[PDB]
Nucleic acid binder design. Structure first.
Ligand SMILES: C[As](C)(=O)[O-]
Ligand SMILES: [Zn+2]
Length: 184
DNA sequence: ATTTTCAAC
């Protein structure tokens, strides 16, 4: 049915390590893009896809998604509601590529939730996030409900509830403030 | 378990 999953789900320790939202965490070299997609076609039942992309034919996760979407998914006369949950926000090359992809495809609507802001203090990365926002993508910080959603849908949770870590809300508030300063 | 965000010299 609509249970189609692209890629592999994370084990719990991989999720907890990668989606930790301390603004300056060390040793998180991977980029995880979880996604859900609503496929809306006028005379068909609405269908759903979800999955997980990582880095690397070499490719950052955001580009891996776009390349898979264009090559395997994107159809005529179909609307797409896409939500991303990324562990790191995009680099400027990825941000520019996603922005240009969205300009090319009016039928695709993208919402980006991000656990952390990658190089938020660098103006080239700020510009990248700004251009993403200006081309119609809503960029947001992952909060409690978003981490809980990912735990439920992209993790081998083994029916255990999401356990939020200490500092999750404080970190969210710091990051959301920095994001609003960037998008101003 | 008052079932892990917040409880802040
Ligand atoms: C967060 As990246 C370095 O895959 O654009
Ligand atoms: Zn990139």
């Amino acid at each position: 049915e609509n249970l189609y999953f692209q890629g592999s789900a994370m084990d719990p320790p991989t999720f907890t390590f990668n989606f930790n939202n301390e603004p300056w965490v060390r040793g998180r070299h991977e980029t995880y893009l979880c996604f859900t997609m609503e496929v809306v076609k006028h005379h068909s039942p609405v269908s759903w896809k979800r999955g997980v992309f990582r880095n690397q034919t070499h490719c950052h996760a955001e580009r891996c998604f776009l390349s898979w979407f264009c090559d395997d998914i994107l159809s005529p006369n179909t609307n797409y509601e896409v939500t991303w949950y990324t562990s790191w926000s995009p680099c400027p090359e990825c941000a520019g590529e996603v922005a240009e992809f969205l300009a090319r495809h009016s039928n695709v609507n993208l919402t980006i939730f991000t656990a952390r802001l990658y190089y938020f203090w660098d103006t080239d990365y700020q510009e990248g996030l700004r251009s993403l926002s200006q081309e119609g993508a809503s960029v947001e910080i992952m909060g409690y409900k978003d981490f809980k959603y990912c735990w439920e849908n992209f993790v081998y949770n083994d029916d255990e509830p999401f356990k939020p870590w200490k500092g999750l809300k404080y970190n969210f508030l710091f990051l959301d403030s920095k994001l609003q300063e960037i998008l101003e």
